[model samples]
Target chain A: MNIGVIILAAGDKLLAKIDNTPIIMRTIRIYGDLEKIIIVGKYVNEMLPLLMDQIVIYNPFWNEGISTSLKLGLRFFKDYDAVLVALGDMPFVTKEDVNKIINTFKPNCKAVIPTHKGERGNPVLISKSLFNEIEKLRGDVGARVILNKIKIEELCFIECSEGVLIDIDKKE
Target chain B: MNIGVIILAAKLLAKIDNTPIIMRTIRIYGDLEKIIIVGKYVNEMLPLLMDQIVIYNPFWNEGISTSLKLGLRFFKDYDAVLVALGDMPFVTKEDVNKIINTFKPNCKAVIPTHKGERGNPVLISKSLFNEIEKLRGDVGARVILNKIKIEELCFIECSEGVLIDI
Candidate 1:
């Protein structure tokens, strides 16, 4: 599956570092290899080496919220078929879990999300067809707004660990 | 009963408009009598701030709740304390005033919410201060917020997009 992934590291949830390793690096390593992946955040210079080559999309309007980074990363995937939108704080989303979501994506499907105890989770797979809907969102609005209106067949959901739903925004 | 202001900034966070985030907030509440700063970066933040208010630098290694308790001890005589996280770039004096305007004697807190989501610089009444002192760990006033009744909290919908903290 030659799918693209958008690692949203731009939000305030970005810890800069988690458990010694940088949060961005730990999140990026989940996909492995830099091709077809974009890491968006305020720390562009800090993220450059981790991605290799200069694919870091610096989100200048980070304070405006997650939608800005979502839109910013979407710009890089115009030529691709579908993209996985993942949050920076959700470090525990395993690659196997992501694989399950990607493979679950069917033709003409609007999105492929995971569910943990009936609650929807992130790293959602969005087809290029829904890019405009995501692009139009303003402020801190998450991608779930577009998925909210889709039919059961168009919106696919698989069972995954609750790790996909949890995020570590502020330091504890 | 008076309103005390606490701008919690533990480190040198991003500055907007060439001014430190902490001072930018202090400027909005500078005229107030009980304004105070609690954080470890006092030396770095002091140059921007010329306020006569006190700056309490606790051993930040102890975590957020410690500093909060440290600052709360200074607000006994005040009616409430407006706690503003220093990193928000968009909060203005008018926004502070709007929250202060909602501070009724019978309220536990006056919070600013945009599109139903709450943001920083929350105003908690002195009645809640004792409960706030009991909180621990990285959690801030939110711990106390969860314990209180929904009606006890006054939710003011701030439009004009001024309600957004960052």
Candidate 2:
């Protein structure tokens, strides 16, 4: 299978540091040796220092909003079977939760989201068949529109810790 | 495009789910219009697989690739080939299309993956025929797959990933 993944980290209002390591590295280690991980961010200078095996893709229009990063990430994984769109700031999400989301994935599923309690979370899995439907939006539009079109059967919600919805943000 | 099915030999006449492993593989792909099978116990398979093209591998000791080579001979007219494990009984005709539909123009092969890992029932193009023939060891088409450009592959994720031979 031509399996691939993407980590969306182009825009970071807060340069969050966890134990002095880049928060993105924590999410990268969870999917160890799974497939070619494309870290979509402007932080290439910061990431190369880490030893994790991954390829990088640039998103210059990332300053616009979440949609640009999401679009870039989806377009980056065009030929892949299933893509995992994760957040670099979500370091609290565990490998076990990522594995749970992956295990629950059926190839036919249109969307698979890991949730902490009833709240949906990040690192959503999208099938390549429906990837073209995702848009390169102007503002904060992201994958939320997908839930409306996807059938309940196709939209899977796997249980995980509250870390699924947590992303580091500046308080100001 | 038309596709073919090839089942490599089962050494020592293996059995799974109360049936011969090789026999199970043949049954799963029988729905396909064109399928070529390689077997050591030709007499036993001949009666059940009478309608399909079945060949006997006398040099069974040479290794599994020999049987694969024999099966490829009959698939000369096909555009691509889907190689299924002779021991994986759960693979069915439905599983066949799931992998075949994933074939893109740029990809030389379409692999059915479990999670991020690639597994059996690979859809390979005829372009790799020469590479497949040169295979010698206990290995299969994977040796050649590694050599192909990474850009030339489409992965077909499937639920039957766990349903493989022991």
Candidate 3:
């Protein structure tokens, strides 16, 4: 199955400033490849110069939560059998790790989640079979709800030591 | 010379969340091939994984600074190196990107400093054969600094559009 990675980065204020490098720039540094990058946000046009030509920018209503962004990004690449959804602010997530998650994704699985010491983490891989369920998702809570409602056996938990769950938000 | 990875995770929160996955998954994952992982953290036992192991519960006075942890990790493989800082938080899969994006692979050593700011992390090539030999202090920072002088150091300025959360 052809896989595409979607970095959900529409929330501009969240990416404002850090030591001269913006949040999105950090994401690009790690995951920038020839693959298509789907940016979901209001001012996505502003991010054009920082990406490759295959990048697609989609804007959902500003008030909508991250689930909307996921929906929009998945829609843009509807034909792709599997999509890897990554949060923009998660800069620590290495491209090597992301590819590991993608590599482990199987046709029968609904999602492939990276786990650290048994805790589920991001850059979750969703097979095309889950497309209808993802579209029905609502609000800003992200994909957790959909994942919980499904059978546990359908989810493949790949262990990783890098603690992909940690973010830079609360740093001193 | 075999290449092994040692991850130093100091922060209490990261110890629980990030370090294990990076150490195990990255090392065992097909991308890294046969490379083994040795993880070191402060005030904790190294979790069980399929690799050589070491845990340094440095006394509170040492506080397990980045340099000391790196120095300890260096003991596992002395031939050559690729060192990664755990705090970098956003490191991704594209190992090839670091190599390809580098401006001077022919240089004696390669480091990924952002816009010449001397960013938090770098990749060290084998070219600095002499400088690495002279290293004596805890090698976290001084080793890379000394390498800059002898080797052809390259800089990669990732476009401003990318988001680096670290």
Candidate 4:
């Protein structure tokens, strides 16, 4: 019943500098209570001190894109019952909201997405069964393909505020 | 706190005659721990063996609606919190599915609704502090409206399957 949260922290140095704080630190503050936190990035060695006690892995294939970072993070916790894949840039997610998703987890569900207004948002909950599919991912796209291919029956859409979807991406 | 469920069994005689016995028996069987049963019409007197006891009352004021019957049934337990509402007839498993999906026990104000859907069904979670404001007459609905607008409001917009025709 323990939940492991994986944070994808590998991003361009330019993107990281513009945001000021290390993305891993921001993600840890919001989701610190997670039984375990796995941060993936080339700069994780430098950012490790910022996220005390969290498992940090250097994705040597930084040029390969965000999917590689995600794949690395997913591999760290192959035995977990459920893994919450969170983006480092989206630091605004409240611990209570994330806990709500974890508490409502049901067996055999594929992904539990948080929605706002009418658009879908992040911190998707993935069952352990989807690990193989996530490992095959390549390039910059995150888990968009798995999200679309999963049956609607396996999805749990939570209606939450827009803050859950906010990322540091400059595009308004 | 211990939670007690009270179901309002009051129905008009004609309505009772039209409803099948299987449905009535099914409802009674579901609530094996029921404390009391109150029937609104004469036919309810026939099913004396179904519960610990049955009480009959002549319903007055037709304009007040069914909520009145619910209020009357649990009036003695004024301080007690009850999720008093009728089950939606047209509600699908998907509808109930969404409600269960979004339910948060920590939420102070819980209302089951859908995004942009008209005439959404709502379920309110009880807060002990708010129970003090429950008043006589139609004041209960007003309290519910006020509670729904509070800052801590938790709402779930279920899929289209949860819609009911009032």
Residue A126, candidate 1: how far off, in angstroms? Answer: 0.6
Ranking by lDDT: 1, 2, 3, 4
State which candidate, 3 or 4, has the greater lDDT: 3
How far is A158's C-alpha from truth in model 3 (Å)? 0.7
Q: Which lDDT values do the candidates have, in the order given?
A: 0.69, 0.66, 0.54, 0.53
Q: List the residue pairs that clash in candidate 4.
A: B114-B157
Q: For model 2, which pairs clash?
A: A1-B155, A2-B155
Q: For this target, which candidate reaches the highest lDDT against the unseen true structure?
A: 1
Candidate 4 CAPRI category: incorrect
DockQ of 4: 0.01
Off by over 4 Å in 4: A11-23, A170-172, B1-166
Residues B1-166, candidate 2: write the lDDT tens digits.
7687876643424666577665666777766744444334544444444344344454456677766765665565578888877667666667677888878788788888776777888888888877887888667778879869888877876766325665
Q: In model 4, what is the error at residue A119, expressed in angstroms?
A: 1.6
Give per-residue CA lDDT, model 3, range A1-172, as digits (tens): 5787877776354355567887667765666662545554555434533432334344434367777777766764576778888777777888777777888887657899999887899878888888888889887777778888779878887876563786656444
Question: Each candidate: how many clashes?
Answer: 0, 2, 30, 1
User: Which lDDT tens digits does candidate 4 get at residues B3-36?
Assistant: 3333333322223446543233324224332222
Candidate 4 matches the true fold with a TM-score of 0.46
Shift of residue A83 alpha carbon in model 2, Å: 0.4
TM-score of the second chain in each model?
Answer: 0.84, 0.82, 0.52, 0.49
Question: In model 3 chain B, where is the ten-residue run with the lowest total lDDT?
Answer: B34-43
Per-residue error at B166 for model 3, in Å?
Answer: 48
Give the Å shift of residue A89 in candidate 3: 0.2
Interface C-alpha root-mean-square deviation, candidates in order: 19.1, 24.3, 21.8, 31.4
